[PDB]
C-alpha cells in the first residue's frame, strides 16, 4: 500500500546556556525507528524499532555523523537567521526541518519532501517537481539563491528519487511483520449516565496501527457526526494508537445507536452496540 | 537512510 519515510529535525537555541538542543527522529509511516538527541549521554543515532537493529555498524556510524553534522549546520543557520532577520543574540529561536518520500502501492515515488521552518513559520521548501523552491520571504530568498547556485536541489532530487525510495522499500520488507500487517483495533462501547434522562455512549478503539481510523456513531442508520464528541487520535505508548467517539443518547434509546469502525486491519467494518 | 548534505542558509 501507500507508505512514507520521514526525518524530522528540531534545533532550539539557548544563548548563554550553551549549545542549541538538537533532536531528530525518523519515521516509517506511523512508526518511529530512529532517534538522536544532543542531550543524550550516548551522542549517537539510537534504534527505536526492532527491524532496524539488523543494520550493521557502518549504518549506525553514518546516521550518527549525519545527525551530528545536522546539529552543527543548524547551529550555524540559527546565527545566520539572526543576521537575515536582524534579531538580537539574546532570544531563543527554533529551526525545524522535514524531508522524506511517499511511495504508492507499487513502490514507485509518489512525492518528495524537504522544507524548513523558522520560529514555527515556513522558511524555504522544495517544490513537488524537486527542481525549484518556495521561499516564504526575502530572507528565505537569500538562502534560495545560494541553494540554486550550489545546486542543492539536484542532490535532494537524486536522494528523493533514488536512495529515499530504495531504502524505504528495504525497511518495508525487513519490518513487514509490523509495517505491512495492520493491527486491528480492540473495540468496545461504554455507557455513562448523565441525568435520569440521558447518558453517554462512548465507542472505544484501542491498540490499532496505523493511526488512520474512522469512528462514527449512527442512530438507526443515520450519521450522528454533527453531535459526536470525537477525540484526536492519541498514542497508547506501545507503538499503537487509541481513539474514542461519544454521543449523548436519551435514556432507553441505546439500542438504536450503532458504532461503526473502519480500519485497514479490520477484515470487515465493525458495527458495535451498547452491550449491558 | 538519511541524506548526506551540508546546505547552509
Amino acid at each position, epitope marked *: 500500500g501507500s507508505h512514507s519515510m520521514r526525518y524530522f529535525h528540531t534545533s532550539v537555541s539557548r544563548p548563554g546556556r550553551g549549545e542549541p538542543r538538537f533532536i531528530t527522529v525518523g519515521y516509517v509511516d506511523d512508526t518511529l525507528f530512529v532517534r538522536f538527541d544532543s542531550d543524550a549521554a550516548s551522542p549517537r543515532e539510537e534504534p527505536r524499532a526492532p527491524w532496524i537493529e539488523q543494520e550493521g555498524p557502518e549504518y549506525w556510524d553514518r546516521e550518527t555523523q549525519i545527525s551530528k*553534522a545536522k546539529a552543527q*549546520t543548524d547551529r550555524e543557520d540559527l546565527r545566520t537567521l539572526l543576521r537575515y532577520y536582524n534579531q538580537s543574540e539574546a532570544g531563543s529561536h527554533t529551526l525545524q526541518n522535514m524531508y522524506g518520500c511517499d511511495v504508492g502501492p507499487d513502490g514507485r515515488l509518489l512525492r518528495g519532501y524537504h522544507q524548513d521552518a523558522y520560529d514555527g513559520k515556513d522558511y524555504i521548501a522544495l517544490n513537488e517537481d524537486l527542481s525549484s523552491w518556495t521561499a516564504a520571504d526575502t530572507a528565505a530568498q537569500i538562502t534560495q539563491r545560494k541553494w540554486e547556485a550550489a545546486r542543492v536541489a539536484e542532490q535532494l532530487r*537524486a536522494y528523493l528519487e533514488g536512495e529515499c525510495v530504495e531504502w524505504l522499500r528495504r525497511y518495508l520488507e525487513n519490518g513487514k511483520e509490523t509495517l505491512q500487517r495492520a493491527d486491528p483495533p480492540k473495540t468496545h462501547v461504554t455507557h455513562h449516565p448523565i441525568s435520569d434522562h440521558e447518558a453517554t455512549l462512548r465507542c472505544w478503539a484501542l491498540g490499532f496501527y496505523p493511526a488512520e481510523i474512522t469512528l462514527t456513531w449512527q442512530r438507526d442508520g443515520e450519521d450522528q457526526t454533527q453531535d459526536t464528541e470525537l477525540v484526536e487520535t492519541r498514542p497508547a505508548g506501545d507503538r499503537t494508537f487509541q481513539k474514542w467517539a461519544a454521543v449523548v443518547v436519551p435514556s432507553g434509546e441505546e439500542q438504536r445507536y450503532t458504532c461503526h469502525v473502519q480500519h485497514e486491519g479490520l477484515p470487515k467494518p465493525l458495527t458495535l452496540r451498547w452491550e449491558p | 537512510l538519511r*541524506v548526506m*548534505m551540508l*546546505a547552509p542558509f
Partner: T-cell receptor
Amino acid sequence: SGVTQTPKHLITATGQRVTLRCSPRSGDLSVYWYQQSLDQGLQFLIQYYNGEERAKGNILERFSAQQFPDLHSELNLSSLELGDSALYFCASSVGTYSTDTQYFGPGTRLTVLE
Amino acid sequence: KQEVTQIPAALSVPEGENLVLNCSFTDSAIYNLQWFRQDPGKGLTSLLLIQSSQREQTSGRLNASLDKSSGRSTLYIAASQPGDSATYLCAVNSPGSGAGSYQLTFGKGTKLSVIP
C-alpha cells in the same frame, strides 16, 4: 576570476620558513590548502571560511595558516624538512556546501634542500 | 580512513579510441565525487561533479558513474583527442573529523597519453 597563488616557485634551505599567499576567486569566502607530494599525492591540509578555521587535516603544528579580512590566505611552512618538497595548491569555494565545486589555483612548487 | 585508488597509474590510448578510467574509495558515506584534470604548468580543473545520490553525470565527451555501495567510479572519455593528455584525478568529498566537516580526498591519479 580565478584563484591566484604566489610565489610560483620556492627553493630554500632546511630549517627555513616560507609563506605562501593565495587570493580566492571573487565571491568565494572559503579557502583550502592542499599539499601534493610525490609520496602521498594531493592531501588536504586546512580549510578557512570567512577568516575562521573550519576544517583541518593532518597538518603539522609547524605549518600555520590564516585567512585575512580580504579573504586572501597565507600558509606558513616553518622548520622546513626535505619531505616538505611538494606542490602546494590553494582552492576556494563559494561557501561550505557539500554540493558544489572547489576551484584551484596554479599552485606553488616548493623545493627544500639540505 | 577515506582513501581513493585509481587504476591504471598511467594509460596510453590511440587517438580516436574511447577510454575508461577507474577509481575506488574506502568509505561509502560521501557528499560528492569529482573527476579532475591536472595539467603540468597549469592547476587543477574539476571536469564533473556527481552528487551523493546521483548515479552518473555527463559533460560533452565525458561520462562518469558513481556506485557508493561498491565504492567505485568510472570516467568514460569518448573519441580520445591528443588534448585529453593529462593526469586524471578522482576526488571524493566526504566528512572529516569534526561534525559538519568535509574534505576532498584524492587518488594518486592516472596519467593519460593520447598518442596521435
